[PDB]
Design a protein around this nucleic acid. Structure first.
Ligand code: ZN
Length: 272
DNA sequence: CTCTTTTTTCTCG
DNA sequence: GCGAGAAACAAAGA
């Protein structure tokens, strides 16, 4: 997932598991708990979930006053809420059991991670990762953004993916954003002029907030939280190779590889 | 059979 | 520091 999908999951969990006491925690893949599964089981068992937050693509479970469980779903992680007698599925790895249901984490590729940290360590955790601002008009300052782009000869798509200019873009929404802002993904950032950077800044905010409003992009429906999204029906370029650009000049969307990633763009709208 | 494809961190030169 | 490439891992498709 990217930020809109994680925010969608966050909202669903907030409605369903806040106020619930954790009765037990069980793992079939304890190695994804990077701070140690037995420690996490010992500390969180019997605690009540107080809230669910998010920073960038990270989910933050607030559990008791003093603990934060930071979860990253990486490429394929999925949460679902099930009854206590639901059968195990092949790629289920962790479960938090409540009195009347359980929260199950599944991840086919085993990339997702859980980290238990203290409340007063959450802000340092994200500072150490150098995560950039949230994609909102209030937090995402164009002036700093502009200065960072000016100092770099990185290509704009990979620099946006780093999460340091702004948090939350992944491959789908960086392709959508650069098409909307009419910028080629291999454009060196120090060549962008002020008006392009302004359009890019606003396009990042608008695309991600639209995606959040529509419940994220679900390339299929699942048993899992966040699988009811509708943003996938609004994508203009991601996965649209060979289809016509929707601005209607008859150009086909093309797919290239940029810094190892599949990259979809309109060669008329997005000139190098 | 092999190769390629689908977030963050790691290696190497 | 940089960029390129690969790796953690699993499954599907060519
Ligand atoms: Zn176009």
């Amino acid at each position: 997932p990217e930020l809109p999908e994680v925010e969608t999951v966050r909202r669903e969990l907030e409605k369903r598991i806040v106020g619930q006491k954790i009765i037990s925690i069980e793992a079939t893949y304890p190695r994804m708990v990077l701070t140690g599964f037995e420690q996490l089981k010992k500390e969180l068992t019997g605690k009540t979930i107080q809230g669910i937050s998010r920073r960038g693509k990270y989910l933050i479970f607030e559990i008791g006053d003093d603990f934060r469980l930071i979860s990253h779903l990486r490429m394929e992680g999925k949460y679902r809420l099930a009854t206590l007698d639901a059968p195990r599925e092949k790629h289920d790895h962790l479960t938090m059991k409540f009195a009347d249901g359980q929260l199950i984490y599944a991840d086919v590729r085993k990339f997702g991670t859980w980290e238990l940290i203290s409340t007063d360590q959450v802000l340092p955790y994200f500072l150490k990762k150098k995560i950039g601002p949230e994609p909102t008009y209030e937090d995402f300052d164009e002036k700093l953004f502009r200065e960072k782009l000016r100092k770099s000869t990185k290509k704009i798509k990979p620099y946006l993916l780093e999460q340091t200019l702004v948090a939350g873009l992944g491959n789908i929404y960086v392709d959508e954003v650069l098409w909307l802002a009419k910028i080629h993904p291999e454009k060196e950032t120090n060549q962008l002029i002020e008006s392009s950077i302004h359009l890019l800044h606003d396009s990042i905010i608008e695309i991600l907030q639209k995606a959040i409003k529509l419940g994220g992009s679900s390339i299929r429906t699942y048993s899992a939280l966040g699988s009811t999204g509708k943003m996938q029906n609004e994508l203009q370029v991601y996965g649209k190779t060979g289809e016509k650009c929707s601005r209607g000049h008859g150009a086909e969307i093309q797919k290239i590889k940029v810094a190892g990633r599949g990259t979809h763009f309109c060669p008329v709208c997005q000139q190098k």
